[PDB]
Write a protein that binds this DNA or RNA. Sequence first.
RNA 1: CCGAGCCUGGUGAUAGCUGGUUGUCCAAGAUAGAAUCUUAGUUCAACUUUAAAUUUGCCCACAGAACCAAAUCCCCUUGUAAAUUUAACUGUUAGUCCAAAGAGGAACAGCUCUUUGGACACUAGGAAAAAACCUUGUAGAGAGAGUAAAAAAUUUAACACCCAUAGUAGGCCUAAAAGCAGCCACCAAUUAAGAAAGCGUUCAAGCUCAACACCCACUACCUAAAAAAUCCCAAACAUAUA
RNA 2: GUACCCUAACCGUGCAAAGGUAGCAUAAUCACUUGUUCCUUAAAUAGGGACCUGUAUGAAUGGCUCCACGAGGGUUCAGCUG
RNA 3: ACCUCGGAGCAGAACCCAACCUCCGAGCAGUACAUGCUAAGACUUCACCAGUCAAAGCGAACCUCAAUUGAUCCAAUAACUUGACCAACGGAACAAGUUACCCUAGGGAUAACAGCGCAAUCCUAUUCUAGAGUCCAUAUCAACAAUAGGGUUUACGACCUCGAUGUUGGAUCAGGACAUCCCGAUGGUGCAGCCGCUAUUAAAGGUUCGUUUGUUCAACGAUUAAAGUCCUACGUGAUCUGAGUUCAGACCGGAGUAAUCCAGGUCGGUUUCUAUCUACUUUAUUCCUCCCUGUACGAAAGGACAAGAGAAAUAAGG
RNA 4: AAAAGUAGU
RNA 5: GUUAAUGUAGCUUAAAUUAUCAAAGCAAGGCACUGAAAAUGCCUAGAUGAGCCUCACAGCUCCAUUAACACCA
RNA 6: GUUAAUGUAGCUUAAAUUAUCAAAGCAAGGCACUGAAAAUGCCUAGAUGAGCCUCACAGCUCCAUUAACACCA
RNA 7: GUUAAUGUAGCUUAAAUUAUCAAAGCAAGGCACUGAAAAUGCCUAGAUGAGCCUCACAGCUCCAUUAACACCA
Lengths: 205, 111, 120
Amino acid sequence: KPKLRFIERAPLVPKVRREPKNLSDIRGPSTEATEFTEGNFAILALGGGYLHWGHFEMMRLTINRSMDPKNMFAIWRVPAPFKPITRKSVGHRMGGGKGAIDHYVTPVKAGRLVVEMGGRCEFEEVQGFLDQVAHKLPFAAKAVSRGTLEKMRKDQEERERNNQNPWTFERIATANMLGIRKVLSPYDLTHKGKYWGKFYMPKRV
Amino acid sequence: SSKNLGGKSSGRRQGIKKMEGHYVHAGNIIATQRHFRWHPGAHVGVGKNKCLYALEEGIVRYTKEVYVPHPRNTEAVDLITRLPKGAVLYKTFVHVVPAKPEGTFKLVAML
Amino acid sequence: KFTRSRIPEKVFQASPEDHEKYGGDPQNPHKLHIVTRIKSTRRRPYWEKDIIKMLGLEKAHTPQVHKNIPSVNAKLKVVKHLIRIKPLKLPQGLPAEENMSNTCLKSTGELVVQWHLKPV
RNA sequence: CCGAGCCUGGUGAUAGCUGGUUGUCCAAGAUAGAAUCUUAGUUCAACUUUAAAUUUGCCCACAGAACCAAAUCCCCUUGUAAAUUUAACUGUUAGUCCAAAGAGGAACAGCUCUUUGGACACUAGGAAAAAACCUUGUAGAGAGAGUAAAAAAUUUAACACCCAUAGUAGGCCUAAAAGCAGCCACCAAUUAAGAAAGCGUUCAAGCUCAACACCCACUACCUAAAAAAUCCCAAACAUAUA
RNA sequence: GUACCCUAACCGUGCAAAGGUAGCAUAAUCACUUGUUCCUUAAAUAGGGACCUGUAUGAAUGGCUCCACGAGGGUUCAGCUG
RNA sequence: ACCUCGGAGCAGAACCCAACCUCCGAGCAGUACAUGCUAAGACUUCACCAGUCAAAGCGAACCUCAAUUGAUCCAAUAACUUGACCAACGGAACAAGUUACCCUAGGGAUAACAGCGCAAUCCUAUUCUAGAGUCCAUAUCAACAAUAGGGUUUACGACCUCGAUGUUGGAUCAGGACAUCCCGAUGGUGCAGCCGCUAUUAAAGGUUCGUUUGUUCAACGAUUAAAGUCCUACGUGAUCUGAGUUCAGACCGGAGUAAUCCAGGUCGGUUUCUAUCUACUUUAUUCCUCCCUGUACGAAAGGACAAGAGAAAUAAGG
RNA sequence: AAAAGUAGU
RNA sequence: GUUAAUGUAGCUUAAAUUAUCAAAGCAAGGCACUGAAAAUGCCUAGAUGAGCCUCACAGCUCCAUUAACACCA
RNA sequence: GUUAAUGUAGCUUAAAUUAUCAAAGCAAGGCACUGAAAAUGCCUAGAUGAGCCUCACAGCUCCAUUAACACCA
RNA sequence: GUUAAUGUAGCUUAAAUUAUCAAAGCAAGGCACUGAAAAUGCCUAGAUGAGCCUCACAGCUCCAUUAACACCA
Ligand SMILES: [Mg+2]
Ligand SMILES: [Mg+2]
Ligand SMILES: [Mg+2]
Ligand SMILES: [Mg+2]
Ligand SMILES: [Mg+2]
Ligand SMILES: [Mg+2]
Ligand SMILES: [Mg+2]
Ligand SMILES: [Mg+2]
Ligand SMILES: [Mg+2]
Ligand SMILES: [Mg+2]
Ligand SMILES: [Mg+2]
Ligand SMILES: [Mg+2]
Ligand SMILES: [Mg+2]
Ligand SMILES: [Mg+2]
Ligand SMILES: [Mg+2]
Ligand SMILES: [Mg+2]
Ligand SMILES: [Mg+2]
Ligand SMILES: [Mg+2]
Ligand SMILES: [Mg+2]
Ligand SMILES: [Mg+2]
Ligand SMILES: [Mg+2]
Ligand SMILES: [Mg+2]
Ligand SMILES: [Mg+2]
Ligand SMILES: [Mg+2]
Ligand SMILES: [Mg+2]
Ligand SMILES: [Mg+2]
Ligand SMILES: [Mg+2]
Ligand SMILES: [Mg+2]
Ligand SMILES: [Mg+2]
């Protein structure tokens, strides 16, 4: 069966404990699935963000409505929604605890492949509707191939060699050159100067 | 509402009271803990509440040493007989190297 | 949190291309530093406010000689952006006592030993 | 002026509450918390001041600190001059924002709450005015001098030209499905045109596209909207040398 | 819960000291609410007469009619008047 | 709802660390019976009070646990000892409602109105091509989503004001925005024509009178070219109103033993001001009728624009 | 002492 | 926190040791069936461990249940 | 939105743990037939899930149904 | 202008999935004939469509409608 499955809202063993919202699940490069597993053409996530169940339906509709199940397959790469989100009821004053578990999200970091697609097809073909779905994703995304993606990282290790701007961000943060760690995060020692909050700026080394 | 009560105990101040190389005396509490962290080694006793006191004056040293639990310590000799044969457990220990001798002999009487 | 930084010891080893940008040779390193405060100790943490009061650097743009020994360098590594370091490069000798009454610093950092203001 | 008259006395009632506190000059000086009918307050601790006695105090390097990230602790050297105890006290103990790690809330608030550090309630220059951002702090006269921080940069979407025959009303099931509702195979002529990729048809027909031929040659920059309510808001300027 | 409008004449069962009886009723009577209908109006969240879930009416905490009366509070024909 | 003690997270690696932040627990049970007596040195819940550990010695054998708790004074006891859901848990020996009849001291340290911040809810526009539209995404409508905007609502925060910033509707006078209801011009149409639907541009001009209710609203009647969306301290009370709401009186239903109370209703209920200062005080649209004519269009019912004539209405000025 | 009913010509 | 009284066939009472009866309960006993009233039979651990002898019967051990009081820090 | 109560044979009632007795419903029998009555039977996932020990059983874990409270300008 | 909640053989309820019955009305059953009662069958687009797995069975597309509301203070 070469079709994306019924990924579901609110998993079956539910989360009675209300997890604190940690925002470290969104920052920086991915540590999970950033590289392919038996596919060719995929959606890259060039920004952090959560993924609602209304976001999985837009993916499960417009891929499976416009992919031929004789010639192409598709698998998810993201997990199920597991992180619960609390919503206090409408119009309530501050304080009083934590509200009930309303819905669920899954956190996607930047540089993570979210949907994998392959088969007897080409990338100039499936750009027709992977670019359709990557604009409705709630982060900056772009459709990659196996071969188009690695073209991007060939340039990203070229921009760290080409430039004659004699200071990089890696040089100044690590050495603490202008006393700059008064204004820098510990996490921007180890990300690079590229990520900043949720957002990824690819246009800088 | 806020069904969560009782989260209002203070931190217990359990830690090392004498770091490595400190000149401890006979009876100072070297380290204080619950749920064993540093085991008592040479010339270091242990209390009821697992505090580590020194018994000999000297310098406190911290090492890594082989764990062999007491055979009537049933909670650990079961834990020993599940390892593969090449294994040992290596807890960390607190010693006191003594600094004064036990004494000298003094002439009191050309008698 | 914001806190005291260790700096890697990778950056305090000069490249072979770095010995051409400045005037030093790695064998025979210099004896004393010239340390001059060029930045304020305000809007800086309290540890940098304490280091500056030890190195004699309470006053901006007054140079100071500190030894080129690693116990001084350690204090200088944690305050190296408030200060400007040049080697004290003596052209002539160390001053003798008959000589020592008329010396000048000569920024370009050359503790010249004979300071008479007639021209060449 | 009666939810209990008025006058005098007690009475200078009491007020953790508001207001007010009068010469000149110099000096040190910013708030970890805990109890409390306590959170508009006070007592202790902390921080601060003074007078003393003594000897170390900050900064730190090897080594060292648990199993189930930034860093800190301990710490000789060294740079430095403070620290600890003793004696006497008052006051502050209703805080703001910025950076960073977090928690609550909308991954809202000039929001609330902790931590680390700043700065502010201390003067001055800058960011238009400006508490909190940046530069900078130990004081006076000067019609001297070098500097510090310090003024935003951007303007985008042309496109191939011609030509198209034919085993075919390609087999199935369909009122009918002829390349184009659906299945199956994807064979094939001339040089060259898919058992056909989009419209158009009940279906057929009609349009293109992919093809020979045609040539100079695909010519190929791969980009990214704007709305309030008294009246736009410095004036303006592309060109003489860091 | 029934004959049957899906409503109780009745059946079965519990508690009570007694289970709100007679009247009146969308009221100066929690809400729904501008209940529904006839009249009044060209038009009526007003007013008058009824129907009754008043599920929070109700009998000297007085209930309901009725003659007079009221600088009481609403509705109105007609006249009249800046 | 909580109030004291304990484990765990936030607080990742000495110690510490809030929260009406997330989760678990405790207010004891069990064995001894040396759970005897003393005594160097230390830890410490950020103070104190309390809590902790313990070498040696005298004396005899040869404690588990995480919290598992309560000061002083007084009682009872010959003495050793023993007394609190003193749980508001550092504990007042023993004391509840109510106040719109209220008073005083303060507070913008703290709420209502108004401003401001924010934009979750609201509103709008685009991106995307699902699907409606017999076919056909883009005439019109639009799913899941994305990106911007606005600052009209319900909120939320508590920053200015409690040694007073007067409060809803209405009257009067209006200023402004345009996201246009009418009038004007234009593109598309699933626009035959008439009416329309939608979009660009345009804010000079205009935008009705009544019954009911305090009503903004809304329902309705009659029209109109149309009966705009909003802001302006929910514009405007030193210009007015006082019907409601928001004091003292009073019923009614309910709550409560009562006093009293109610986003429940209903009758009634004082709206002050002589102007110092700023500011200021005389500068054209639209409808309809006739005509085109019963033409253009359509098959017909239906039916135009344009040009032209003339009538009125408002507004402004006499 | 306790007995209630029997469809329409 | 202290006294004082009391436990029974399933429920009420008592007899000075030697333990009496009405309900409940099981039967026939009788009529076309329910209830009394008679009755035989049946069920008294006389609340607890011993006894100083023979104990509802008595000096202790308590298991409890109820009276009369007195406790605040 | 918050508090407190309560989830039972098809129905309602209880029992301080073991779930009774009263309908209804099921077969019999008395009456010509049915009722009423007399002899029997059956019927509760005791609303929701693990068990520290044994739980309608007592702490919860859950969904329905009701009460009283959603105010001050 | 707002949300939540319902949409059924013809009528009603339900089954908290797998679709029950009383009727309107079909004809057997039994009586002289009919009523009543009993035996069945019928007849459920589950209000609307792509199903993601399969669907009253669940999120919606959708066409009506009951309520709560937009009041204030
Ligand atoms: Mg803790
Ligand atoms: Mg604490
Ligand atoms: Mg006084
Ligand atoms: Mg006070
Ligand atoms: Mg000073
Ligand atoms: Mg108080
Ligand atoms: Mg703040
Ligand atoms: Mg053609
Ligand atoms: Mg009423
Ligand atoms: Mg009179
Ligand atoms: Mg201490
Ligand atoms: Mg001992
Ligand atoms: Mg207290
Ligand atoms: Mg207390
Ligand atoms: Mg009154
Ligand atoms: Mg009164
Ligand atoms: Mg007052
Ligand atoms: Mg406000
Ligand atoms: Mg379509
Ligand atoms: Mg304020
Ligand atoms: Mg605040
Ligand atoms: Mg005020
Ligand atoms: Mg004033
Ligand atoms: Mg416009
Ligand atoms: Mg106003
Ligand atoms: Mg005014
Ligand atoms: Mg009057
Ligand atoms: Mg007036
Ligand atoms: Mg003035």
